[PDB]
């Protein structure tokens, strides 16, 4: 960490300790923040402390006997102490749905930023790459299994110039399984399928590479039609055809090679985290003095 980084993490932890127990009645809804794959996310105000939080709701029935362990598990699963993972305030349950309260990122997600930005400049994506790598490094240490992908909608930013990942250690699907595990977990997936589900960090690197190309050109780089047929044809194209690449003559050689090494089809030849962190693009980006906060505030009109 660095001085300002640890300090901000310390400050957040102080705020977390001051909040205490989280109950639904203590929240006032301000605005909807975004629409998720598993439930909507709202900007809320925690009245007793006056803290602005992001409140994610997950529709699920949790029985009273099951409830206490589920919550206690959720508290643990969200315990992050990284400057690159979105802060976590607490989780609770009321009336057939679960609330996950986290640090409000007033810059929104990068898919939202991308929409207003059109496309995101290479030097900005340099800072994004560094944060994602360090975020993935921290997550892989804490969890053996990831449950969420690297994608623009999962990269949150703010006016302090911070770039963070959502906690990949938890998903709405996992929580469902946890609730089911008290009745009796039944998996009918073959060993080879389960091995595929427990993907290595090489899959995260692929996702980062594809996301970087998407954000650099302002569009998901592999086009597809609508309907079931077009969906299958897209996935088959990803599996069996050459990966997408940046439009030639636009971006630096370093950034070009960086995303190409992330998108190599063979995961054994695909670059790993160590190789990426010392890549020419990363070393150049780390040296660059980039005003991310300034660009962000000008782009989405933060101030
Ligand atoms: N802590 C936060 N601060 C600000 N905005 C947030 C926060 N969390 C989520 N959002 C916004 O709400 C949207 C919904 O997030 P989420 O429910 O995680 O959807 P998702 O990530 O697309 N689903 P998944 O496919 O499981 O990752 C995000 O894309 C963000 O724009």
Author numbering: 42 to 344
Text taken from the publication that reported this structure:
The extracellular signal-regulated kinase (ERK) cascade, consisting of three tiers of protein kinases (Raf, MEK, and ERK), mediates mitogenic signals and is critical for a wide range of physiological and pathological processes, including cell proliferation, differentiation, embryonic development, and carcinogenesis. Activated Ras interacts with and activates the Raf family protein kinases (ARaf, BRaf, and Raf-1), which then phosphorylate two conserved Ser residues within the T-loops of MEK1/2, which in turn phosphorylate ERK1/2. Previous structural analyses of inactive MEK1 suggested that its helix A, which is present in the N-terminal extension of the kinase domain and is a structural feature unique to the MEK family kinases, stabilizes the inactive conformation of the N-terminal lobe of the kinase19,20. Here, we report the crystal structure of a cancer-derived MEK1 mutant, and demonstrate the molecular mechanisms underlying abnormal kinase activities of the cancer- and RASopathy-associated MEK1 mutants.
Among several mutants tested, we succeeded in crystallizing MEK1(C121S) and determined its X-ray structure at 2.0 Å resolution. The WT C121 residue is in the N-lobe proximal to the helix C (P105-H119), which generally serves as a regulatory element of protein kinases, and resides juxtaposed to the helix A. Firstly, C121S mutation not only led to destabilization of the inhibitory helix A, but also affected the orientation and conformation of the helix C and the T-loop. In the mutant, the relatively small side chain of the mutated S121 residue faces in the opposite direction relative to the larger side chain of the WT C121 and forms a hydrogen (H)-bond with a water molecule. Contrary to the previous assumption, the MEK1(C121S)-helix C does not move inward, but rather, it further rotates out from the N-lobe at an angle of 20° relative to that of WT MEK1. This excessive outward displacement allows the helix C to create a coiled-coil-mediated stable interaction with the newly-formed α helix (residues 213–224) in the T-loop, thereby inducing an extended, open conformation of the T-loop. In contrast to inactive MEK1, in which the T-loop is in a closed conformation and partially conceals the substrate binding region as well as the active-site cleft of the kinase, the extended T-loop structure of MEK1(C121S) uncovers these regions, thereby rendering this mutant readily accessible to its substrate. In contrast, the DFG motif of MEK1(C121S) adopted the DFG-out conformation. The R189 side chain is rotated toward the ATP-binding site and directly coordinates AMPPNP (an ATP analog) via the formation of electrostatic interactions with the phosphate groups of AMPPNP.
